[PDB]
Design a binder for this molecule. Structure first.
Ligand SMILES: CC(C)CN(C[C@@H](O)[C@H](Cc1ccccc1)NC(=O)O[C@H]1CO[C@H]2OCC[C@H]21)S(=O)(=O)c1ccc(N)cc1
Lengths: 99, 99
């Protein structure tokens, strides 16, 4: 499908048995979700956003359902203005930018 | 053209007489560039993201060349860690996300 950008490109995700909304974010290398419970162990990760650097929780190999597709990969959990699906998972979906 | 997301989608822009590299950012509502001077009036603004908020100056109706194409719109200028082309300008090039 094709998604224009007059409004935020928000999609429904299913992660950790929870239905949420998230921003398709080509400016994000990594996927960052607001605080939630995920299984398994996490490791520390520091990410640099527009406001500076933040400690987040890195969970690896996490199943997420996005746009009718299952992806599996690294999900960072931490204080973010909004859930963001970064390039690590958008590539799993085969997203490209087109003009 | 079609731009991959395996790497950050960076493109060359021309703005304020100056050539720069910028991140195509579907996750960014507005275009924000690293501190520079732009002609005309501006209004102070705060934008929030991963690390918190940054204070920027908002210039309206600023001409920018992106991917060889001339567009106009709002440009926020401030202490962002990188130049970001937001949705407000990407729409004007008919940019879409496709999968
Ligand atoms: C958090 C989003 C809702 C908004 N951010 C846009 C987003 O694309 C930023 C854009 C961005 C890009 C680089 C540096 C700072 C901000 N990326 C980002 O925070 O990514 C972090 C998560 O993965 C990592 O990969 C890149 C940085 C890390 S934002 O930069 O804060 C932002 C907010 C408002 C406007 N107008 C413009 C930009």
């Amino acid at each position: 499908p094709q998604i224009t950008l007059w409004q935020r490109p928000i999609v429904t995700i299913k992660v950790g048995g929870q239905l949420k909304e998230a921003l398709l974010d080509t400016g994000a290398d990594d996927t960052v979700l607001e605080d939630m419970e995920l299984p398994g162990r996490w490791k520390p990760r520091m990410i640099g956003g527009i406001g500076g650097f933040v400690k987040v929780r890195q969970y690896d190999q996490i199943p997420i359902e996005i746009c009718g597709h299952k992806v599996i990969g690294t999900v960072l959990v931490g204080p973010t203005p909004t859930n963001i699906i970064g390039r690590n998972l958008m590539t799993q979906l085969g997203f490209t930018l087109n003009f």
